[PDB]
């Protein structure tokens, strides 16, 4: 019973494309989905989260789509550049603050090709 | 404008996961829309198609979900089967029966793994 499920695995893209990394998980108790990215050779690092109170979280670029009633969320990589070739964790965690573990999913990598 | 674009370029399923390949056609004009389905070193043989008028199609297991309004398609591949392993293509031409250009996109190479 994995409950962060990640897709796709691979995705290559083109510079300026739109990449849709998406993500569905099972546990109803999740209100809190941090999105990690990790470059080659290094840790997760926290690139943008989205709490189940809202529907999308805007950064520069970078969208958190989440729908709560279908328990799917995707993150959208507007012009995908080729520094944003990393792998994209989505993690659930069922609250911020309290201590409940954080349930990370498999990953989706990414490659943008100029 | 872009003829024909295909998004993604290449993308990696678990087996059983349903994949889709993206494209988007610039011309108004265009009518016809084939898919086809190229393996490692063979020629590409028509796997499904759509028109204009018809804006969903089932081959079994496979779905081409056709948006004229946005000049958006997709190819769907149900549970994808690691055997679906290959590139696929999206063509476009402003008539079938007639001999009208087929404006080819250039694919997205689908692997597909248990």
């Known amino acids: 019973m994995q409950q962060v499920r990640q897709s796709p695995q691979s995705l290559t893209v083109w510079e300026g494309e739109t990449a849709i990394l998406n993500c569905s998980y099972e546990?109803?108790?999740?209100?809190?989905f941090p999105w990690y990215q990790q470059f080659p050779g290094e840790g997760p690092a926290l690139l943008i989260s989205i709490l189940s109170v809202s529907n999308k979280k805007e950064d520069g670029r970078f969208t958190i789509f989440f729908n709560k009633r279908e328990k799917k969320l995707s993150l959208h990589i507007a012009d995908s550049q080729p520094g944003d070739s990393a792998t994209y964790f989505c993690?659930?965690?069922?609250?911020?603050?309290?201590?409940?573990?954080?349930?990370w999913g498999l990953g989706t990598s990414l490659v943008v090709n100029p | 404008m872009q003829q024909v674009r295909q998004s993604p370029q290449s993308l990696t399923v678990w087996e059983g996961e349903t994949a889709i390949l993206n494209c988007?056609?610039?011309?108004?004009?265009?009518?016809?829309?084939?898919?086809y389905q190229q393996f490692p070193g063979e020629g590409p043989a028509l796997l499904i198609s759509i028109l204009s008028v018809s804006n969903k199609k089932e081959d079994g297991r496979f779905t081409i979900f056709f948006n004229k309004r946005e000049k958006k398609l997709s190819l769907h591949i149900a549970d994808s089967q690691p055997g679906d392993s290959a590139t696929?293509?999206?063509?476009?031409?402003?008539?079938?029966?007639?001999?009208?250009?087929?404006?080819?996109?250039?694919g997205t190479s689908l692997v597909v793994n248990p």
């Open positions: 993690a659930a965690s069922a609250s911020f603050g309290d201590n409940s573990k954080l349930i």
């Open positions: 546990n109803s108790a999740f209100d809190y």
